[PDB]
């Protein structure tokens with residue numbers, strides 16, 4: 348499982364870096380100890396092997412799988428186009444869109460790690476436990492994913 352988490356990290360990193368250069372909006376939520384099955388069930392089931400290639404193809408704009416969140420559970424991309432709870436926090440900047448609000452929302456009610464790619468800026472953001480790491484560098488993203496996902 349140790350190699351699966353590292354492959355998960357590398358897949359997120361490659362897909363997000365690919366989509367960030369192209370300003371392709373993306374929203375990837377990795378479940379952890381708390382189940383996210385209710386929101387998996389809101390999307391289109393994939394139950395697919397994790398890969399950067401599939402993550403990218405899912406988020407291509409105007410495609411059947413892009414409008415929503417990808418939820419990763421265990422060693423599978425469980426679903427795409429899932430809905431996530433939107434945070435009601437007035438602290439979150441109005442310059443950020445609903446992807447960040449969804450990413451903040453799910454982080455308030457689960458211990459899940461959620462990664463966002465802004466289609467406006469290409470900035471990669473991350474949410475965990477109700478907090479937002481906005482516009483992280485590749486180094487910062489790699490350290491956070493290593494810390495939070497390799498357990």
Ligand SMILES: Cc1cccc(NC(=O)CN(C)CC#N)n1
Nearest residue numbers: 415416429430431432433445449
């Ligand atoms: C991934 C994503 C993108 C845009 C909006 C949302 N979330 C909602 O629309 C909130 N619903 C009403 C609750 C649920 N589930 N999620």
